[PDB]
Design a protein around this ligand. Structure first.
Ligand code: HEM
Ligand code: FER
Ligand code: FER
Ligand code: CYN
Ligand code: CA
Ligand code: CA
Length: 305
């Protein structure tokens, strides 16, 4: 029963405080809008959007931050702390960490040039973190299209539009050499690069990510507009210039009969992509929320009250 008006009486400036925090951080860290969107996705795919990802380690449960999809990868946690502190100062004990992160993701998208919309609100915060579930549920860059579809369905997103539109988050941000080395030098034990990678881009990427090189070096997900939220991600796919395997599979998989037309539709029209992104974002944001009196409004996003 979420609603976009949930804080219109109790904390009417929450989205403004969130926005100003991100505007400021972007001057020194141009990557932070992308990092924050990713945090929200990794929240919603593990027991729902319940801020379980923000919890640090305790002696009775491990943090999701040591999951394969989060360790030495997920980032931005201090920025979420700063905006939470600012909102707590303005509207004490009102806005859940789960909702804060949902607003932060939306405002990140708008600030980077994407659509503007009011997210549904009224989620509450978990009482535990789920490390094993994060290892089970977050999809990996080496997944096939059937594995990606199974990963989305497992959490409740059955639609191929959900998968294709939400993969558009890779219109900005960075990726480590580590996750493309197989594609550049030895794909699926063939001793060859992935044939679905454009051979001119292949040269470029080998230059950035040499064999025996720094596996933690960073590369841009979108070679056209690395920091702008736009539909250029889909244009790249159509040219075999998706960066990671899971990107290019949306256009090139044997199982892509349903996803190819969505990829083209989104490359062809900014409005069609933005409308679908908003619709899929709100469906992801509605995965198994705690509401009403279930869970908490956490005061410090890293610890249960
Ligand atoms: C469909 C399956 C997906 C997989 C396999 C995947 C995989 C990845 C991987 C491997 C990275 C780079 C991590 C690093 O190098 O440490 C990345 C980054 C990122 N992903 Fe995804 N992702 C997927 C879906 C999504 C979705 C649904 C969104 C959001 C709507 C998202 C938003 C992003 C962003 C914005 C970044 C850049 C983060 C920054 O630069 O800090 N991804 N993803
Ligand atoms: C209390 O802090 C803030 C309040 C606002 C209000 C904005 C508006 O009413 O448009 C904006 C930024 C802030 O940091
Ligand atoms: C770093 O990004 C990710 C890595 C994995 C999995 C890695 C593995 O199984 O080794 C899954 C999701 C991610 O977002
Ligand atoms: C994306 N993780
Ligand atoms: Ca969660
Ligand atoms: Ca872009």
């Amino acid at each position: 029963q979420l609603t976009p008006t949930f804080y219109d009486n109790s904390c009417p400036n929450v989205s403004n405080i969130v926005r100003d925090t991100i505007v400021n951080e972007l001057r020194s860290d141009p990557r932070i809008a992308a990092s924050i969107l990713r945090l929200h996705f990794h929240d919603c795919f593990v027991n729902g959007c319940d801020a379980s990802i923000l919890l640090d380690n305790t002696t009775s449960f491990r943090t999701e931050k040591d999951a394969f999809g989060n360790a030495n990868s997920a980032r931005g946690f201090p920025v979420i702390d700063r905006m939470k502190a600012a909102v707590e100062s303005a509207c004490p004990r009102t806005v859940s960490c789960a909702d804060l992160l949902t607003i932060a993701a939306q405002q990140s998208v708008t600030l980077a040039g994407g659509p503007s919309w009011r997210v549904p609100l009224g989620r509450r915060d978990s009482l535990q973190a789920f490390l094993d579930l994060a290892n089970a549920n977050l999809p990996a860059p080496f997944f096939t299209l059937p594995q990606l579809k199974d990963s989305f369905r497992n959490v409740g997103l059955n639609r191929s539009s959900d998968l294709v539109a939400l993969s558009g988050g890779h219109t900005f941000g960075k990726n480590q050499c580590r996750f493309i080395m197989d594609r550049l030098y030895n794909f699926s034990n063939t001793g060859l690069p992935d044939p679905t990678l454009n051979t001119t881009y292949l040269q470029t990427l080998r230059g950035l990510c040499p064999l025996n090189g720094n596996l933690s070096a960073l590369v841009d997900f979108d070679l056209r507009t690395p920091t702008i939220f736009d539909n250029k991600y889909y244009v790249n796919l159509e040219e075999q210039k998706g960066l990671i395997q899971s990107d290019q599979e949306l256009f090139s998989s044997p199982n892509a009969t349903d996803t190819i037309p969505l990829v083209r539709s989104f490359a062809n029209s900014t409005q069609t992509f933005f409308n679908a992104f908003v619709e899929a974002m709100d469906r992801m944001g509605n995965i198994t929320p705690l509401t009403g009196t279930q869970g908490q409004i956490r005061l410090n996003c890293r610890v249960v009250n």
